[PDB]
């Protein structure tokens, strides 16, 4: 299954946010792994994925690279610093649950913010312990910490306690 | 024997209902069967379909999946709860038919709401006996309960009573 980058529909501009750079790097890497392009052939044709605001920057620093990993690391370094751990822990305990959001959206967002720490440092139990201190008073007064036995149960008891009109 | 999902027009933003999740899962299945993509080469590309809240949700739970079957099971499990027994019975007796509604739509809705109970729990006779007690007065003054059996006849008597009026 020979191929190259010519057909790809993804592209990246000069935006200086974080989510855009992360989604772009992830999509490009998954495409390169799925279509079977060679590990070195891709570097010779990467220039077809840049707008008019970043092409000058790529022209300015082409020679400070030799293999694909260095180029991806260089993009990540210049356009958006990676988050260190302490800022993640700081963000997790800031905004406590409001008085209107359903439990499902809260659990989804908190789980989405907790996967960015290095893998294997936290198994299921301590994660459930960290999450349990911020729930709003409507749920804490019925369900307790005696019986949770992982996440799948907490959503179930929360849904049954939510259908009952509080 | 290879390809991405990038060509599709379907996307699932996340809403707690049944018809939307069912139609989306069916369209994705037909697409994967038609373009020939294989099972383990297909899971890697699944991320391109989700958007909005569904993207954050898939970013959450990802290490619990391993093959295509687990992914469909997780989507169906988290985005369309199975209603327990008693709520269906409670929903069933809280909505009598109005004066302005043909027999067909009413019987079709009340039948569609009854198939979610566990299979084999009911007989055609007991179900039809349950269906009465809600029909509006315009139809109950003619057809009698001991002159009908299967569902094929109630629609017939209702149509003849409707056309005369």
């Amino acid at each position: 299954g020979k191929g190259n980058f010519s057909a790809c529909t993804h592209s990246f501009g000069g935006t200086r946010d974080h989510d855009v750079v992360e989604e772009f790097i992830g999509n490009i890497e998954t495409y390169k792994d799925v279509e079977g392009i060679s590990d070195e052939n891709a570097l010779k044709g990467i220039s077809l994925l840049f707008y008019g605001m970043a092409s000058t920057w790529w022209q300015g620093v082409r020679k400070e690279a030799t293999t694909w990993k260095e180029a991806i690391a260089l993009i990540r370094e210049h356009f958006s610093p990676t988050k260190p751990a302490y800022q993640i822990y700081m963000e997790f305990f800031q905004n406590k649950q409001d008085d209107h959001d359903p439990i499902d959206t809260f659990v989804i967002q908190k789980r989405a913010l907790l996967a960015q720490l290095p893998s294997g440092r936290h198994d299921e139990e301590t994660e459930l312990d960290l999450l349990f201190g911020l729930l709003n008073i409507k749920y804490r007064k019925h369900i307790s910490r005696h019986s949770v036995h992982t996440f799948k149960d907490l959503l179930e008891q929360g849904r049954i306690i939510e259908h009952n009109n509080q | 024997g290879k390809g991405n999902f990038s060509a599709c027009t379907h996307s699932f933003g996340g809403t707690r209902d049944h018809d939307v999740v069912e139609e989306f899962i069916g369209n994705i299945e037909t697409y994967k069967d038609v373009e020939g993509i294989s099972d383990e080469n297909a899971l890697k590309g699944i991320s391109l379909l989700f958007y909005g809240m569904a993207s954050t949700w898939w970013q959450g739970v990802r290490k619990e999946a391993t093959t295509w079957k687990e992914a469909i099971a997780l989507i169906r499990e988290h985005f369309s709860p199975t209603k327990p027994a008693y709520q269906i019975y409670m929903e069933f007796f809280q909505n009598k038919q109005d004066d302005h509604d043909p027999i067909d739509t009413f019987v079709i809705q009340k039948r569609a709401l009854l198939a979610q109970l566990p299979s084999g729990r009911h007989d055609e006779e007991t179900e039809l006996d349950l269906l009465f007690g809600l029909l509006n007065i315009k139809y109950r003054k003619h057809i009698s309960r001991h002159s009908v059996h299967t569902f094929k006849d109630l629609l017939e008597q209702g149509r003849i009573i409707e056309h005369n009026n």
């Binding site: 529909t9 993804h10 592209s11 707008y51 | 599709c8 027009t9 379907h10 996307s11 958007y51």
Partner: peptide, 27 residues
């Protein structure tokens, strides 16, 4: 039903469409 206003496909809404959001359109 709710045929996509731009791409003329029955699969989504105006706000989000592959041709309009990205694919270097909106020039």
């Amino acid at each position: 039903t709710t045929r996509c206003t731009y791409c003329s496909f029955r699969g989504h809404t105006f706000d989000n469409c592959r041709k309009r959001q990205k694919d270097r359109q909106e020039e």
